[PDB]
Symmetry: D2
């Protein structure tokens, strides 16, 4: 319940799309918290999207409904949407589209299609298509609140520090073009017989990233939430990640301790395990104590159905 | 204990480096199983490396010792090594090295350094440096067994399907060079006054990936292990991943069910939870039944110290 | 602006006829320029006055100008500016300068700078009449047939850009992270050459004059050249027979030579008979001074 | 292989002297070629026989060959091959062909193809003596000063490649996933031009001959050209005064003209006096037939 108030406060200011994003180690339940917050926010009439760059398609399993690239309404909710990212499917569509253009020339076309196939099969495309859709929804509106289940770290978010580098490189390209512009004219006269485009795209990207950065670094719009478990791994990790997000100047309004073993436990096993969870809980209330901390228990049931989802919802709110 | 025999069998054939790689959902304990298998294999005199593309640096937390990029001996073991990947640190080193070269020219150098800064800050570099080191150790020897804690999926391993695409594109480039080679000569005569390199690098990469693919698709060298939990998420996920690895023709010798609640449990909580874990266990013995299945319990202690590590070791062996 | 241009074999006196026509047109108040792509700088010898690249008034004439082309000088002149502008990168400036020197020393630059100034004055006004002493042939003027080739190649580049434009964006989103310029320059050149071609193919604006000698070489040559100029659709209003031995001659030598010149004159009045033929004699004096120039002027007019 | 090359103003008879020297050298058993970059195809008119690009025997001489340069033809010839080879991509072939036509029509191709065949025969053997009727000047021959510029630019490219080589690999590992060729061609050209320059600057191999007329134009011109050739360190073994009016002349016309020719002859024996001067008269007949050719031959030898 401890989180509700903070959320409510976040919603009002800076009218427009509000962003919420959960982060934490693998497991640890951030996809879970995302789905739950989506359901809760969708309970009040609100138009909320949950975007997921998960290739494992976790939201498919949690919701039990398949989701395409385009936003899909979920579970009879008129107002709740989820965006699943498949770079491969997209890629097939782009291939159809390209093939359509290349009819006049097969050789040019088979070549370009090959280059694309290689591009898609390259190691960067997951994270970079993730990037593309992220920017698409940072620039977007028509969604009252956006929940990123893309799992952020300072290291995944390192692209936020680019615009300055882009500035330096751009001024370099401008100096260069000024030096060159004279020479190429004399070559164009003595022996007759791209930059503006590179600068266009560079500047465009610079502005997109700068906007996104300004939105993310601003509360009243974006809320970063850490989710953790009472175990040293997730605690230390999320601490470091918190420090990197700090380096990007990002607000973290809340930490969520998850899968807590309930206070009623009897057999020695869960006795020991909960002793440990209490030690780690003191560790958490030490390191993360300056932040709002929420607690969710370890459910008797596995957390799957919308019922368990609404349950967790009320547990956080 | 059920896994030991299979491992032993894997070690003997195809003398050279033997590869073992664990995969599964976030959490689920694959870094854990990796560390444990590393310890176990290091117990018999064997030279074993555990490489981790984890930016969260899990092995630092589990072992409690810091690891650099170059292989580092761990915990008094003369024979046990772990490789942690930091792309950023590397990047700083590359920057020092570049700056050293650019002294004659600052403008060229500041530009190139800018391009690199942008490269490193780009969304692909984590996964692609992961790729680079992966290939480095596929091509490598002097390590008796290599354990990849890089978390593989069919989708991360999609780069294995490239060599054919590279073949098509290469033959395209050859046809092209044959068509061009005539023309450029007449231009070189009528109006006086890269390919071999592109083909060199393309072919080189093609052979590296082909070698790696052939090694990974071959038992007696590489063993892919899935680790799962008695929960629908990890089960379905690891099933799909198993199918993609199947598409790349990869052997999966073993599935490891982890964090099992021990058979002695009393209070109703763990009663319900273990009932569920049994249902999911039947689900597992159904889907994954054609594979060797190993069981590890949920430890009273959090799994951190080398003692818990050796414990889990004997539990699997 | 009216354009007059003389052509013919080496020697044969087209630089001479150019100078003379310049003087004659400058006699009536008219502003006339004689541009010369001669690296030989023949106009320097004929006029006796030195001429720079920029149009220079000649021989006390307020209205008569001539332009001499030196490519080397222009190159070197630009180099200084280049130095001033690219200080950093310092290495780049030296490379670019090297490319420039390599360019200037290349075999194309004479003819192509000739081309550049030609187009400069085809596009120009403020000169009532322009006289080109650049020596035209159909082969020198072959650049006039370009604009159609430029069209084909341009449409090729457009089809190409339309084919590429889709691919590049998709590549960009899959892997984040010149044509318009090439087409700009190509189209600009196409329009300059089309304009020039249209002016040159049009009388009331441009007059092409052939100059010849009563010898088979120049006759046959200028005939072929006439046929190429024909292929570009160019008017040739006049043929000028030059260095004719005057009708008063006595010793057997010039008797024989003038007999030959008469045979070749019938050859000329045969081949070139369909156009105006003018006759200039072989002057007792070498043709140098402005006096001989005005003399030849009145001889043609 | 020995090289002989004539130079001088338009007219002035260097094509003539070339043909004559060719005949004379072909009289003694010798294998001699006369190559001509004349688009005017003067040798076609002088010899009366047509000549293709490949060396053609002339006038029943087993040993006398001449090479006429037509660039257009060569281009067109290659186009067919290009078509046969690039079928797919079909679009590419049309673009490349367009670039080819655009190249051939460009103002540089005459002089630069002249250059190409020049280097072809400088590198060549199997011809005992080669006579270049391409009309040399220091300005035409300015390409000889390149190899040093090529050196500077090459070392620039090497420093550059060393600076880049480190960066590119690191970029490659950070983001997976021409010079040697440029240096190959640059160095090759540098060696060809250096060889040619060394041969041309060396007597016992190459003889540069200037031809002039007793008129201030050709005299001053060929003097300056002589000074440029001097700047490239070239031997000029002989000056040939041509079209001299014979000493038997009577009527006042040729009296005056030959007076002038004598003044200019003293000018020549002044400026060019330090080198061998040869004299050829103005022939009663136009110089065309092989008979007049052999005549001039004996006149020079
Ligand atoms: N409060 C909870 N009670 C019980 N199980 C939970 C709870 N929160 C999360 N889980 C379980 O933890 C597992 C990992 O959570 P998930 O959000 O899918 O991982 P990730 O955060 O890495 O995407 C899921 O199988 C989920 O069912
Ligand atoms: N047998 C086990 N008993 C108790 N805890 C375990 C066991 N195996 C794994 N864990 C815990 O599960 C968490 C996730 O495991 P880890 O391997 O770090 O995740 P990943 O596989 O995603 O790298 C770790 O904190 C680890 O301590
Ligand atoms: N009508 C003429 N009478 C006498 N000499 C002439 C006459 N026309 C030209 N010449 C001479 O012929 C030579 C070459 O003429 P020029 O016009 O310089 O050649 P080009 O036309 O090739 O430039 C000059 O020395 C000039 O003095
Ligand atoms: N010695 C000579 N006697 C008579 N006519 C000559 C003599 N030398 C050259 N000519 C004539 O002068 C004209 C031009 O000479 P040519 O050699 O063709 O010029 P270029 O040397 O510029 O090619 C030709 O028509 C030729 O007949
Ligand atoms: Mg998730
Ligand atoms: Mg891990
Ligand atoms: Mg002239
Ligand atoms: Mg000639
Ligand atoms: Zn219990
Ligand atoms: Zn007489």
């Amino acid at each position: 319940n401890s989180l509700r108030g903070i959320t409510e406060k976040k919603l009002e200011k800076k009218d427009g799309t509000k962003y919420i994003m959960f982060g934490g180690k693998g497991g640890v339940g951030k996809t879970t918290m995302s789905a739950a917050t989506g359901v809760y926010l969708a309970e009040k009439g609100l138009k909320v999207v949950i975007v997921s760059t998960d290739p494992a398609h976790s939201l498919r399993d949690i919701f039990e409904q398949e989701f395409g690239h385009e936003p899909t309404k979920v579970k009879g909710y008129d107002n709740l949407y989820v965006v699943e990212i498949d770079p491969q499917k997209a890629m097939e569509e782009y291939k159809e589209k390209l093939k359509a253009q290349i009819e006049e020339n097969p050789f040019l076309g088979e070549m370009l299609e090959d280059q694309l196939e290689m591009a898609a099969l390259s190691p960067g495309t997951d994270e970079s298509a993730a990037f593309d859709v992220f920017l698409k929804y940072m620039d977007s509106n028509e969604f009252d609140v956006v929940i990123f289940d893309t799992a952020p770290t300072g290291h995944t978010l390192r692209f936020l520090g680019m615009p300055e580098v882009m500035d330096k490189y751009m001024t370099k390209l401008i100096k260069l073009r000024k030096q060159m512009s004279g020479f190429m004219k004399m070559m164009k006269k003595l022996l007759p017989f791209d930059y503006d485009k590179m600068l266009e795209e560079l500047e465009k990207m610079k502005e997109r990233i700068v906007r996104a950065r300004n939105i993310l670094s601003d509360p009243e719009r974006t809320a970063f939430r850490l989710v953790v478990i009472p175990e040293e791994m997730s605690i230390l990790e999320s601490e470091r990640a918190m420090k990197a997000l700090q380096k990007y100047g990002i607000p973290i309004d809340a930490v969520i301790v998850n899968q807590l073993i309930p206070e009623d436990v009897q057999c020695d096993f869960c006795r020991a395990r909960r002793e440990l969870q209490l030690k780690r809980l003191e560790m958490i209330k030490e390191k993360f104590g300056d932040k709002v901390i929420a607690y969710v228990p370890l459910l008797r049931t596995e957390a799957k159905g919308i019922e368990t989802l609404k349950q967790i919802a009320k547990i956080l709110y």
